Amino acid sequence: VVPTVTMLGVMKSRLVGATRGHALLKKKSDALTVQFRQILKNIVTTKESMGEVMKDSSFALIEAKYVAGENIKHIVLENVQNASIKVRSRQENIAGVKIPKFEYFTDGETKNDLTGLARGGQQVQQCRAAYVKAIELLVELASLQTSFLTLDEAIKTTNRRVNALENVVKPRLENTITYIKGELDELEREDFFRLKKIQGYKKREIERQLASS
Amino acid sequence: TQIPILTMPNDDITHPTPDLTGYITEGQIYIDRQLQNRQIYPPINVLPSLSRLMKSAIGEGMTRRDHSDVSNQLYANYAIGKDVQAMKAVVGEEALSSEDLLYLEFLDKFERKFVAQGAYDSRNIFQSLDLAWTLLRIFPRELLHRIPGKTLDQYYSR
Amino acid sequence: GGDFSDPVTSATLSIVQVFWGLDKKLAQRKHFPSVNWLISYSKYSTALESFYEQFDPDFINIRTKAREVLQREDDLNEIVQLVGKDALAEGDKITLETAKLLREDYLAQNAFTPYDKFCPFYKSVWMMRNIIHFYNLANQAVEKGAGMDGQKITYTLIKHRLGDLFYRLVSQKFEDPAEGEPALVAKFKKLHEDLTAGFRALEDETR
Amino acid sequence: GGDFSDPVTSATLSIVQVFWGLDKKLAQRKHFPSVNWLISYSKYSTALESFYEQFDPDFINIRTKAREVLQREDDLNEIVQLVGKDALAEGDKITLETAKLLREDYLAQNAFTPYDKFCPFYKSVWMMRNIIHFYNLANQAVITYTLIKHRLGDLFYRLVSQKFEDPAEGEPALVAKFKKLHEDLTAGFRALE
Amino acid sequence: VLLGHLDWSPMHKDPLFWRDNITNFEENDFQILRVLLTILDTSSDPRALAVACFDLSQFIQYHPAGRVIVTDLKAKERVMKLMNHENTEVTKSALLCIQRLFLGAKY
C-alpha cells in the first residue's frame, strides 16, 4: 500500500481492531469449548442409562415371554403398550449456537397407548421407559455435534486472525513507518542542510568579494 | 503542583509533544472522545488513566484508610464490567451468570452516576468515597476479593 | 530491499514497455525463472497479434485462458489461506488443478539442464494447448457427468483413473529439444490425442 | 512501551552480556523479584562455570536441570491450556508440580520479609539441590500422580517452609534444615516406591 | 466453593447442616466434596485451611465411608502438613480431622 501518515493511522486502527476482535473471538471460542465439554460429560454420564434401561427392558421381555410365550408381533409388533413413536423438535440457543431440542412419544408429546400385552405394563415400565433415556441421549449427541462444528469454525477463524491477519498487518505498519520516517524525514533534513550550505557559500563569497575590494 | 493540559494532535500519543512529555512527568489523565460522545460530562477514561505515584496520596494520616482498597476494587470491577459487556455483545447475554449481570449493572451505574459529575457538583473526597462504597456494596462481601480484611467489616455494613 | 517504489524502478517502469518483474519468494522456493506472473506485464501483446495469427490461431485464446486460470488460482489461494481446503467447489478444485501443473511444469524451468537450457516456441505452444485441453476436458466433465456427483466430484477419481496421462503431462517438459524437432512435436501430439481419447472415454463410460 | 526495537535497546542488548529482564506482568501478579525467567539470560555462565564447579560440581548440573524444567514449564502451560491437566501423565504432572513449586518457592523472593531479605548463595544452592534432587527422585518412580500427590502433600508444605527459613540461624543451620527436609523427602520418595 | 472463601459461620460448626449436605455432594463419589478436599489440599488463603478441616471432620464422622476416603484423600495430606504446622487453631482442627478418619479404619 502507498505509505502516508493517514495510511499509517489507518493501519494502526486496523491492527487495534483486529486485536480486539481476536480477543472477542477467543472468549467466544472458550465459552463454546466449555459448553462442548459440559455436553460431552453429560453424554458420557447418560451412556450408562443405555445399559441400565436396556437391562430392565430385557428383564421385562423375559418376564413377558415366560408369561405369554411368543409375542404376537407381526401386525402390531406387540412387546409394548406405550410408545406411539412420533418426534417433535425444538431449537435452543447457547452462546449463539442453535442447539436442537428433541421430544417424542413416551419422552414428551405425541404419545398414545392402547391395551397392551400381558406384561405390557411391565414392558412399558421397562422397554418404553428407555425412551426418555434414548431421547436425552439423542439430544445430547445433537448438541455435542453442533457445538463441535461451531467450535471448529470459531477456532479456525481465531487461528487465522492470530496467524495471518495480525502478522500481515504489523509488517505493513513497520514498512509504512520506515518509508515515512526513514526516507521523508531524512530527505527533509538533507534538503534543508543543502540549502543552509548554499546560504553559507553565498555569504562566504560575498565576504571574500568585499575583502578583495 | 502542576496539572499541565496538553493537546495531543490526531487523537494519538505518538505525537512528539505528548510522547516527549510522557517521560518527564509521572502520570496521564486522558480525555476520551467516546465518553464525550456518550454524553458523560467528565469524559476522563479512568481505566487507561493512572498516576505513577498515586500511592503517596493514599494513606492513613492524610485522606482515609480505605482509599487504596476502594481504588483497586473499582479499577478491577470496571475492567471486569467492560469485559462482560464485550462478551454479552457476542454471547447473546442469555448465558451470562449472575455475577456477569452484577458487573454489567455496576458498569452502568459507574458510568452514569459516578463519572458523570455535574459541572458544579463539588464533591469532597469523603463523600466521593462514600459514593464509591455505595457502588461497591452491591457485590457480596466475600466477592470483593481485592479488599483486605478489617475494611469490609468496617464499611460494607453501610 | 526489493521494494518497487525506488526512484530508479519507478522511472524505468514509467517508460519501459515490457516488464519482467521478479519475486523473491519464488527464488526462495528454487523456482528459478522467478517471474511473478501476477505483477509482470507486457504491453507488446497487441503488436504480435499478426505473428500469432500466422503462427497458430489457438495460442491467442489459450493464452487468455491460462491468464484467467492464474488469476483464479491467486484468488482461490487468497480464499483458502483463511477458509480452509475444504468446502471448495469441484470446479474450483479443477481450477487449482492444472494451475499447479502450469506453475510446476510450464513456467518453471531449470535453466541448467540439457532440456531446459533452450525451449522452442511451438513446443511451449503445444504445452499450453495440452494444459488448456486438460482444463477444458475436466470442466466439460464437470458440466455433465450423468449427475452432479458423477460430473464434478469425480476429480479424485480422475486423479487415479487418469493418473498416467497426468504424469505424462507434467513430464513432457523433461524432453530436450536437441532430440529432434519432429520427435518432440510428435510426442506432444501423441500425448494430446491419448489424453483426449482417455478422458472422453471415461466421461462417456458409466456416464 | 516495552518494544525492544529502539536503537538504544538494540545496541544495549548487542553489547551487554547479561540481561535480567524485569517483567511488568509478574509485578501485576505480585512477584517481588519480578524477573522474567523466560527472557533473562546470563552469557557469562560459561566463564563462571569454573567457580560454579569449584564451589559445587553438581550445582551446574542442577542449574541445567532447572533451565530444562523452566523450558518445559511453558510446554506444560499450553498443554493445560489446550486439553487441561487431565491429559498430563504422572511424570508430566510431577514435572509441572515441581516447576510450580520452584516458581512459587525459590525462583520468587519475599524481599520485605526478614527471613528472605537476603538470600546467601549457600542457602540458594541447598534449596536448588533439595528441589531438583526431589524432582528427579519423584520422576524416575513413574506410580499414580494422584497417589504420589497425596504421599508428598506434607512435603509440598514443607518445601514452602524450607524457603521460609531465616538466615539469622546462620548458613549451616539453614543448610542443615534444608538438607534434613531434602533427606526426609528423598526417604519418602524411595521407601514408598 | 464458588466464592472460594472458607469462613466459620453458625451452620458450619453445626452437625445438622452437614447431614443434609452429604447427599447433595454425590455426583461422582462426593464430587463436590472431592473438589472441597482438593480445595483443602490447595487454598488461596492460609486461614481458609483451618475452617476447611472443621468442615471435612463433620462429614466424615457422619459418613464412616467418607472418613476412610478422607484419609486416602489429599485432605489428610493437608492435615498431616497442618499437624506439622504453627497456629494452635489450625492444629486443633487438623487433629480432629485425623481422628475422624482414624475411628473408622479400625473397628
Side-chain angles (χ1 to χ4, degrees), chain A residues 3 9 17-18 21-23 31 46 51 60 62 64 68-69 83 95-96 100 108 116 118 120-121 129-130 134 142 144 154 164 169 171 176 182 184 187 190-191 195 199-200 211, chain B residues 1-7 9 12-18 20-27 29-31 34-44 46-51 53 56-59 61-64 67-68 70-71 74-76 78-81 84 86 89-92 95-98 101-107 110 114-116 118-120 122-123 125-129 131-140 143-145 147-149 151-152 154-157, chain C residues 1-2 4-5 7-22 26-27 31 33 35-42 44-48 50-52 54-64 66-67 69-70 76 80 83-84 87-89 91 95 99 102-103 106-108 111-115 118-127 129-130 132-136 138-139 141-142 145-147 150 154-158 160-163 165-175 177-178 180 182-186 188-193 195-199 201-202 206, chain D residues 1-2 5 7-16 18-22 26-27 31-42 45-48 50-51 55 57 59-60 62 64 66 69 74 78-80 82-85 87 89 91-92 94-96 98-99 101-102 106-108 111-116 118-121 124-126 131-144 146-148 150-151 153 167-168 170 172-173 176 186-188 191, chain E residues 4 10 15 46 48 50 52 64-66 75 94 104-105:
Chain A
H22 159 278
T46 197
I62 301 299
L144 191 76
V169 172
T176 297
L184 272 298
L187 291 203
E190 173 67 47
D191 280 357
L195 191 47
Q199 307 202 40
Chain B
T1 315
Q2 315 216 358
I3 176 170
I5 311 183
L6 172 58
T7 310
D12 63 358
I13 208 174
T14 313
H15 187 273
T17 307
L20 191 147
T21 190
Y23 186 39
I24 303 170
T25 61
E26 293 179 353
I29 320 293
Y30 303 94
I31 296 89
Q34 67 277 17
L35 274 76
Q36 194 275 332
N37 263 351
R38 301 190 63 269
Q39 302 311 302
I40 311 300
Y41 161 68
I44 293 171
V46 233
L47 210 71
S49 113
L50 73 165
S51 172
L53 172 73
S56 187
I58 292 157
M62 73 291 291
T63 183
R64 207 161 72 167
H67 205 174
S68 52
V70 302
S71 59
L74 266 295
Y75 200 91
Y78 188 86
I80 296 162
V84 170
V90 310
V91 307
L96 300 176
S97 74
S98 58
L101 277 296
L102 302 180
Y103 281 110
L104 281 175
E105 71 76 20
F106 152 84
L107 183 82
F110 182 82
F114 187 88
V115 180
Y120 298 94
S122 171
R123 301 203 273 207
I125 193 167
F126 313 121
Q127 62 184 176
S128 193
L129 295 172
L131 272 159
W133 270 127
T134 298
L135 276 70
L136 279 183
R137 270 176 291 254
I138 302 165
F139 307 104
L143 188 50
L144 293 176
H145 303 302
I147 306 287
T151 301
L152 288 171
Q154 176 56 36
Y155 304 103
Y156 190 81
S157 63
Chain C
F4 292 171
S5 59
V8 192
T9 65
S10 286
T12 288
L13 269 70
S14 301
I15 67 170
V16 71
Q17 289 277 24
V18 61
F19 161 74
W20 303 334
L22 307 189
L26 299 177
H31 187 232
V35 181
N36 183 297
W37 51 90
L38 294 174
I39 59 175
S40 294
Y41 72 95
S42 164
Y44 275 127
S45 60
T46 60
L48 299 173
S50 303
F51 153 76
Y52 288 142
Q54 63 84 30
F55 201 79
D56 198 330
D58 291 332
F59 184 78
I60 187 54
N61 322 301
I62 72 188
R63 183 175 64 76
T64 63
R67 179 157 287 154
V69 164
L70 286 165
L76 260 66
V80 69
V83 174
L88 263 65
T95 292
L102 193 75
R103 291 201 302 101
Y106 190 60
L107 294 185
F112 293 117
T113 57
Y115 51 83
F118 182 77
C119 172
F121 180 69
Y122 65 88
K123 152 174 210 199
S124 309
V125 171
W126 280 90
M127 282 215 68
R129 266 197 280 113
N130 280 358
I132 298 310
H133 155 277
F134 180 97
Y135 171 90
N136 296 146
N139 289 318
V142 166
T154 58
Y155 171 65
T156 57
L157 168 63
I158 291 155
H160 313 337
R161 67 177 175 175
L162 206 77
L165 297 155
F166 182 76
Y167 184 110
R168 293 176 59 257
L169 272 167
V170 311
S171 60
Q172 76 200 320
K173 87 166 183 274
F174 280 105
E175 53 188 359
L184 280 72
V185 69
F188 282 137
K189 201 181 309 182
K190 185 64 42 153
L191 193 151
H192 167 256
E193 305 330 300
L195 171 60
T196 310
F199 197 84
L202 291 164
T206 74
Chain D
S5 68
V8 194
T9 75
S10 308
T12 299
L13 288 169
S14 84
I15 305 151
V16 172
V18 177
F19 172 79
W20 279 341
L22 306 186
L26 296 175
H31 280 70
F32 298 124
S34 308
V35 172
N36 180 7
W37 40 98
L38 294 174
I39 63 176
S40 182
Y41 64 92
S42 167
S45 59
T46 176
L48 204 60
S50 63
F51 159 78
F55 178 85
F59 165 65
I60 171 164
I62 284 158
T64 58
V69 166
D74 58 78
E78 322 97 340
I79 282 159
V80 176
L82 65 95
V83 59
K85 53 183 283 283
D92 291 331
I94 284 162
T95 311
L96 177 142
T98 47
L101 178 138
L102 173 58
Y106 175 55
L107 192 50
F112 302 93
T113 66
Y115 74 84
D116 210 20
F118 169 80
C119 180
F121 200 62
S124 299
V125 164
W126 292 97
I131 293 167
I132 297 301
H133 176 107
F134 179 78
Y135 160 64
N136 320 127
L137 266 293
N139 223 26
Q140 78 263 13
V142 180
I143 176 77
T144 351
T146 129
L147 252 314
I148 246 249
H150 166 57
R151 110 209 205 164
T186 303

